Amino acid sequence: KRAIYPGTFDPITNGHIDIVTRATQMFDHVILAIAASPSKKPMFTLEERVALAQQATAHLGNVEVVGFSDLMANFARNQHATVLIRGLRAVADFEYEMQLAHMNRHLMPELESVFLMPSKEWSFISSSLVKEVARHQGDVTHFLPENVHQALMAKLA
Amino acid sequence: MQKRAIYPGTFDPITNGHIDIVTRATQMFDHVILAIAASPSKKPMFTLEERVALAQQATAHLGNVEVVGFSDLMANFARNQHATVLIRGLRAVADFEYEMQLAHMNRHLMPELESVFLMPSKEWSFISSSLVKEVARHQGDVTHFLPENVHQALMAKLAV
Amino acid sequence: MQKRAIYPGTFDPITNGHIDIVTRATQMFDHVILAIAASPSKKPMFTLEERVALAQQATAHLGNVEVVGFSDLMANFARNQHATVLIRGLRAVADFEYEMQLAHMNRHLMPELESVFLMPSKEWSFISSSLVKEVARHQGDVTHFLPENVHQALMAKLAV
Amino acid sequence: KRAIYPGTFDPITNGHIDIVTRATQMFDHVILAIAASPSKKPMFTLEERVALAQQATAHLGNVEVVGFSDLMANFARNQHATVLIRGLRAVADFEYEMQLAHMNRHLMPELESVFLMPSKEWSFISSSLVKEVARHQGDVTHFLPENVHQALMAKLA
Amino acid sequence: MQKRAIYPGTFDPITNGHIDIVTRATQMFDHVILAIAASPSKKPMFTLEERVALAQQATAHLGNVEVVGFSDLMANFARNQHATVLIRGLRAVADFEYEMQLAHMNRHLMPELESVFLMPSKEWSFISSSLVKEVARHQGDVTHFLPENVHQALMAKLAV
Amino acid sequence: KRAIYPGTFDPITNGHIDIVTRATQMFDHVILAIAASPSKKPMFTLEERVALAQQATAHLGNVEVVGFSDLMANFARNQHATVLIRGLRAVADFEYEMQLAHMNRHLMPELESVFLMPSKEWSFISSSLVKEVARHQGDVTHFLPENVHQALMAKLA
Ligand SMILES: O=C(O)c1cccc([C@H]2CCC[C@@H]2c2nc3cccc(O)c3[nH]2)c1
Ligand SMILES: O=C(O)c1cccc([C@H]2CCC[C@@H]2c2nc3cccc(O)c3[nH]2)c1
Ligand SMILES: O=C(O)c1cccc([C@H]2CCC[C@@H]2c2nc3cccc(O)c3[nH]2)c1
């Protein structure tokens, strides 16, 4: 059973590590898929985001980190994935997630969207909030893997 | 991995929305237990025996579904059934706040049990057993939302 | 087009929020039926006869409003009254999820009936008959939220 | 009775056609009003959006398609409209719609805002989602009128 | 300014979430009254006398908290206690719509009373007394969510 | 007892005046703190926003208007504030407010976030909506202090 966990991961946070770890306890192979997302004008290049996520997930044996610029559904078909994982923090996320999931089902009906809920510890964070705090020199060590925190410090230095 | 999943609910009665969710669950997990709550928080329209037989007939075509009644917490039932996945259906009209309370409480009770939210077809995204029962009790047409056996049992129940 | 609209509810009692909605509806549709549900999902404070008389007196100044009791589904009542519009009030504190369930169910029952959501004045956007009754039952001042006839009937009801 | 159905319609989708069709079954004359919306940096010019909507609604006798850069409320007064139609898909839309409707009521109290709910078929789509999928060469034929789908393909070609 | 604040609720039973909120309130206001509602909208598990004693023992370490029972509207109680601040806890799973209704109604009843929303620790953001009671009634472990005295009283209540 | 009411205030509205007035009835000293917020590309400079808010709050004796580009939590520590005030209009605001409040608690646990609800009169307005209406020459006199309305007219003239 192959699952894809797609996202912008700009950068990957402890909330993302929490979701992917839960995914590996459920499915045999997990593809952590980083979308290029140019419309979002990401802080880190796709190459950087892939490198950060690879290092941050090295301890999880059945995680493969890959980048993509393709349509989500086509990339999942090309990875032979039948499960699409997304983390759900609150009601605000739930509405937008439904649109993407119904569109993905329209484009690939055999690809099942599944939602997981992060730990209470990471239920109020996002890449956007972590970047906002770090842009103002606020301490975000608690929310990011060690290698990611270093890269975010270095990127803003 | 040989995953066992539970799909708990009152299923009073089981609807096409519940059939859609359990079918999706059988496509991703090796064994699915459709778990029917014995207890009435509010007194159910169908008895536990009626709810189980209706669900069995309606899922008989799905080879890896087992219909089982339970009277304990859904976390305690998952533990006793050696299930590590708890299926929750997430309709467009779900109480997302309650789902968050339930998932965090289930994780506290059984940390190794993972709550998995599945999405029904758009067709069943705006219905509930509660709404179906209200409509049927007030002489409205609900045939479209139910398996045929459930439609027949519901008409018989409302006739008497 | 000579449109007939229904505005259903329990109106237990009718409030200034309901008056605001029905007034807005009379400004856009030729005939508005303020439709009062006979049934108690939960037992109502005022009887159906009391709810109808209060609503009639409170809307007497609106020439194209008819107050009518009904005991069937709001879709079945709309069909029998040859109404093609169903008015729903949408306060800031409405259960939008339930409104979606209700609208899709009404469309399933009567496809030609269109659910129309109207917005009350900001003044009445945070009240409900339920909240008004709780406040009044616990000796709080609710005069501001009610038509004068309703205020008089509510004080008489709570006195005994 | 004259109703206005205003929006950016960048581009008009089957969800918009669903709403305007419902509006024509209720009101004698419906003005489908396309806002220029430069702040939103639209994909299609106002002239293109008007042309697409005109062709997409040609089968509906009592629909008039017009463009505007004016304040919403002033344009409705100038069209002699007393009804303002807006489609409501979910809770996320409902909150922003309330602000606009109360502002419109402040600017023109006789202009009644009315909300309609689209078919379940179009309850999870938006112009933004359709454009995102099409930018990644995903099939959106199901969600758009034929002429709109052609124009979106041609615009992205 | 010598501010007096009330923190009303049914506290049936008082949980670690309520302790967190009242502790935060004592850090910003000079005197906090933890106000326990006497009335059963729904019949409470613990009697008013039980709810008051449990809350007193659980807040005994906070010098500026007074635990008091009341049977009137929370606005009327705030007025009689000369309180100008009404504390509301805002968990991640709160009914924000109801909180808005309540705040606007309290402002109508007592304009000088300001509703203040406090946020609990993430640890208690997904629990409620209602959920705690359901879990405990169905033999689940709730020790983590309660003060020790409450855990002991709840086990005794469920044993009989 | 010292409270900070931070925000972009681009420009300050009657809804903001309502919140700060409520704050002064509760706390001895209130700091109305205007964040520079360059990421939001504000209409008014920080200097203009500070001047507008100073004039708009001159009648309130225990309000001090200050600008800042610092991390929120650091600025509150530096003002010796133990209370952080934020206005709550609806559910949509409530979710984002929770993230900021939990982040602020992580950065300064003694800084208590408190939420106040504005009057029904200002429950459906925002700086963004007022600017949108004014950009289209719509009347916004009802929603802004006199000096702010003049400045918004002059800025758009
Ligand atoms: O709400 C449903 O969808 C539901 C479905 C089936 C069963 C039940 C109830 C029935 C009695 C105990 C059951 C129960 N409540 C719980 C609360 C928290 C954690 C649990 O593990 C719970 N398990 C509820
Ligand atoms: O919930 C209200 O605002 C409401 C108002 C008036 C009446 C009613 C109930 C009263 C009994 C049957 C009525 C009824 N429920 C329905 C459910 C789905 C579709 C319908 O057509 C329904 N019509 C409810
Ligand atoms: O819902 C709570 O969290 C709650 C807590 C304590 C008490 C109460 C109820 C108990 C009886 C009257 C009380 C009451 N309802 C009111 C409605 C509007 C305005 C008020 O001032 C109210 N005060 C409710």
| C75, C97, C104 member nearest B140 (Cβ) | C75
Reduced to 3 states (helix: H, G, I; strand: E, B; else coil), residue C131 is helix
Omega before F109 within 30 of 0, i.e. cis: no
Task: Pick the residue from chain C with its C-alpha nearest to D82.
Answer: C28
Burial bucket for residue D7 (CB in 10 Å: 0-12, 13-18, 19+): buried
Q: Is F139 on the interface with D (CB under 8 A)?
A: yes
**Helical (H) or strand (E) element with B112:** none
Distance, CA of A5 to CA of F105 (rounded, Å): 30
CA C76–ligand 2 middle distance (angstroms): 10
In the three-class reduction of DSSP (H, G, I as helix; E, B as strand; rest coil), residue C138 is classed as coil
CB C81 within 8 A of CB C33: yes
Give the integer Cα–Cα distance in Å for A69 and F47.
42
Confirm if A23 and A50 have CB atoms less than 8 A apart. Answer: no
> Cβ(C65)–Cβ(C32) under 8 Å?
yes
Q: Residue D7 in contact with residue D44, Cβ under 8 Å?
A: no
Residue B117's DSSP bridge partners are A115, B88
* Mutate which of B73, B76, B81, B116 for ligand 1 pocket (most atoms within 8 A of beta carbon): B73
- DSSP for E79-120 reads HHTT--EEEEE--TT--HHHHHHHHHHHHHH-TTPEEEEE--
Residues in chain C followed by a break, C to N above 2.5 angstroms: none
CA distance C51 to D128: 47
Candidates E119, E122, E123: best to mutate against A (most CBs of A within 10 A) is E122
CA distances from B53 to B10, B25, B48, B58 (A): 13, 20, 9, 9
What are phi and psi for residue F118, nearest 5 degrees? -70, 170
F127 is in an annotated binding site: yes
Distance CA D35, CA B35 (A): 52
Please, how many CA atoms are within 13 Å of residue E128, restricted to the half-sphere of its CB? Answer: 16
User: Three-state SS string across B59-94, please?
Assistant: HCCCCCEEEEEECCCHHHHHHHCCCCEEEEECCCCC
Query: If you search the block for the tokens 């620790």, which residue do you land on?
Result: E121
Residue with tokens 């508005």: C32
Q: Is F136 exposed, middle or buried (0-12, 13-18, 19+ CB in 10 A)?
A: middle
CA D39 to chain centre: 17
Q: Got the DSSP string for A117-137? A: ---GGGTT--HHHHHHHHHTT
Q: Is the dihedral of CA F143, F149, F152, F157 positive or negative?
A: positive
State whether C114 and D112 contact (CB < 8 Å): no
**Which of C133, C135, C142 to mutate to probe the E interface, most E CBs <10 Å?**
C135
3-class DSSP state of C71: coil
Q: Which residues pair with F35 in a beta bridge?
A: F68
Tokens representing F55 are 């004039």
Beta bridge pairs of residue A49: none
Minimum CA distance residue for ligand 3 atom 15: E73
**Is D16 assigned a catalytic role?**
yes
Task: Mention every residue, 6+ apart, whose C-beta is less than 8 A from residue F109.
Answer: none
DSSP3 helix / strand / coil % (chain A, rounded to 5): 50, 20, 35
> Which numbered atom of ligand 1 lies nearest the CA of B88?
3
Angle between the N-to-C axes of helices B129-137 and B148-159, in degrees from 0 to 180, rounded to the nearest 10: 40
Q: Which residues contact A33 (CB under 8 A, 6 or more apart)?
A: A4, A5, A6, A7, A66, A67, A68, A75, A79
Chains A and C touch (3+ CB pairs under 8 A): no
Residues with Cβ within 8 Å of residue F114, at least 6 apart in sequence: E28, E116, E117, E118, F3, F83, F84, F85, F86
Integer Cα distance of E57 and B38 in angstroms: 38
Q: For residue A101, which of B123, B121, D119 has the smallest C-alpha distance?
A: B121
Establish whether E118 is an annotated binding residue.
no
- Residue F134: is it exposed, middle or buried by C-beta count within 10 angstroms (0-12/13-18/19+)? buried
């669950």: which residue's tokens?
B25
Beta-carbon separation of F142 and D91 below 8 A: no
Cis status, amide bond into D11, omega within 30 of 0: yes
Pick the residue whose CA is nearest to atom 24 on ligand 2.
Answer: C9
A8-47: b (≥16 Cβ within 10 Å) or e: bbbbbbbbbbbbbebbbebbebbbbbbbbeeeeebbbebe
Per-residue buried b or exposed e for E48-63, using 16+ beta carbons within 10 Å of the residue's own CB: beebbebbbbbbeebe
A141 burial (CB, 10 Å; 0-12 / 13-18 / 19+) is: exposed
Q: How far is CA E16 from CA A118, E129, E143, in A?
A: 22, 10, 10
Q: How many CB atoms lie within 10 A of CB C41?
A: 8
F132-to-D81, E17, F49, F136 alpha-carbon distances in Å: 22, 41, 18, 7
Q: How far is CA E93 from the centre of its chain?
A: 16
Mutate to test the pocket of ligand 3, among E22, E70, E73 (most ligand atoms within 8 A of CB): E73
DSSP string across chain F: -EEEEEE--TT--HHHHHHHHHHHTT-SEEEEEEE--GGG--SS-HHHHHHHHHHHHTT-TTEEEEEE-S-HHHHHHHTT--EEEEE--SHHHHHHHHHHHHHHHHH-TTSEEEEE---GGGTT--HHHHHHHHHTT---GGGS-HHHHHHHHHHH-
The answer to whether the peptide bond before residue B13 is cis (omega within 30 degrees of 0) is yes
| Tokens (6 digits) for D126 | 């938006």
Q: Cα Rg for chain D, rounded, in angstroms?
A: 15
> What sections of chain D are H helices per DSSP?
14-24, 46-57, 72-78, 91-107, 127-135, 146-156
DSSP A86-122: EE--SHHHHHHHHHHHHHHHHH-TTSEEEEE---GGG
Interface contact D124-A103, CB threshold 8 A = yes
F157, with CB counted inside 10 A (0-12, 13-18, 19+), is: exposed
Positive or negative, the CA dihedral F72, F73, F79, F84 is positive
Q: Which atom of ligand 3 is nearest to the CA of E75?
A: 21
Q: Is D41 annotated as a binding residue?
A: no
Q: Quick one: which H or E segment has residue C67? A: strand C65-70
Alpha-helix runs per DSSP H in A39-90: 46-57, 72-78
Strand order from edge to edge, sheet including C31-37: C65-70, C31-37, C4-9, C85-89, C114-118, D112-116, D83-87, D2-7, D29-35, D63-68
The amino acid present at A36, given as its one-letter code, is A
Q: What are φ and ψ of residue D71, in 5° steps?
A: -65, 135
Picking from A140, A111, A113, the residue whose alpha carbon sits closest to that of residue A127 is A140
Q: And the tokens for D147? A: 């002429």
| CA–CA distance, B156 with B153 (Å, rounded to integer) | 5
Provide the resolution (angstroms). Answer: 1.8
Whether the Cβ atoms of residue D57 and residue D63 lie closer than 8 Å to each other: yes
Residue E23 and residue A96: Cα distance in Å, rounded? 37
Interface contact flag, E131 B97, Cβ < 8 Å: no
Q: Give the method used.
A: X-ray
D129 touches chain A (CB under 8 A): yes
CA angle at C44 for the pair B131 and C142, rounded to the nearest 5°: 115
Residues whose CB falls within 8 Å of the CB of residue E2, separated by 6 or more in sequence, listed in order: E30, E31
Report helix angle C48-59 to C148-159, nearest 10.
150
Atom of ligand 3 nearest to the CA of E70: 7
Say yes or no: F112 contacts chain E, CB-CB below 8 A: yes
CB D116 within 8 A of CB D85: yes
Cα distance between residue D57 and residue F73, in whole Å: 54
C-alpha to C-alpha distance for D136 and C2, rounded to whole angstroms: 48
Fold classification of B1-160 (topology level): Rossmann fold (3.40.50)
Within 13 A of D95's CA, how many CA atoms are on the CB side?
14
Structural domain boundaries in chain E: 1-160
Torsion of the alpha carbons at B141, B143, B144 and B146, rounded to the nearest 10? 130
Would you call F66 exposed, middle or buried from its count of C-beta atoms within 10 A (0-12, 13-18, 19+)? middle
> Dihedral (C-alpha) E139, E143, E149, E152: value to the nearest 10 degrees?
30
Nearest CB neighbour to D115, from listed C3, C90, C92: C90
Residue A44, classed as helix, strand or coil, is coil
Give the integer Cα–Cα distance in Å for B69 and C149.
Answer: 53
F113 to each of A137, E2, E76, E116, how far by Cα in Å? 21, 20, 27, 10
Spatial distance between the Cα atoms of C125 and F120, rounded to a whole number of angstroms: 8
Residues 6+ apart with CB under 8 A from B105: B75, E126, E127, E131, E135, E140
Atom of ligand 3 nearest to the CA of E78: 21
Q: How far is residue C50 CA from its own chain's centroid? A: 14
Q: Is D80 a catalytic residue?
A: no
What length is written for chain F?
Answer: 157
Strands F83-87 and F29-35: unpaired
The reply to whether F157 touches chain D by the CB within 8 Å rule is no
List C6's β-bridge partners, or say none.
Answer: C33, C86
F1-157 CATH = 3.40.50.620
CA–CA gap between residue E16 and residue E23 (Å, rounded): 10
CA neighbours within 13 Å on the CB side: how many for B66? 13
Q: What's the order of all strands across the beta sheet hosting E114-118?
A: E65-70, E31-37, E4-9, E85-89, E114-118, F112-116, F83-87, F2-7, F29-35, F63-68
Query: Please, are residues C34 and C7 in contact by the beta-carbon 8 Å criterion?
Result: yes
How many CB pairs lie under 8 A apart between chains B and E? 35
* Count, residues in chain A: 157
- Contacts of residue E16, defined as CB under 8 A and 6 or more positions apart, other chains included, come to E123, E124, E127, E144, E145, E146, E147
Residue closest to C34 by CA, chosen among C14, C7, C62: C7
Structure tokens at A136: 């103002």
Q: Which of F108, F152, F147, F146 is nearest to F6 (CA)?
A: F108
HSE-up of F121 (CA within 13 Å, CB side)?
11
Residue A134 structure tokens: 């770090």
Amino acid letter, residue E132? V
Long-range Cβ contacts of A104-110 (<8 Å, 24+ apart)? A104/A72, A104/A73, A104/A76, A105/B119, A106/D142, A107/A71, A107/A72, A107/A73, A107/A74, A107/D133, A107/D138, A107/D139, A108/A73, A108/A76, A108/A77, A110/A82, A110/B27
Cα separation, A113 vs B116, in Å, equals 10
Q: How far apart are CA D65 and CA F11, in angstroms?
A: 36
Supply the residue whose CA is at minimum distance from atom 17 of ligand 1: E135
Structure tokens that stand for B33 in this block: 């237990």
Structure-token match 């103002």, residue found: A136
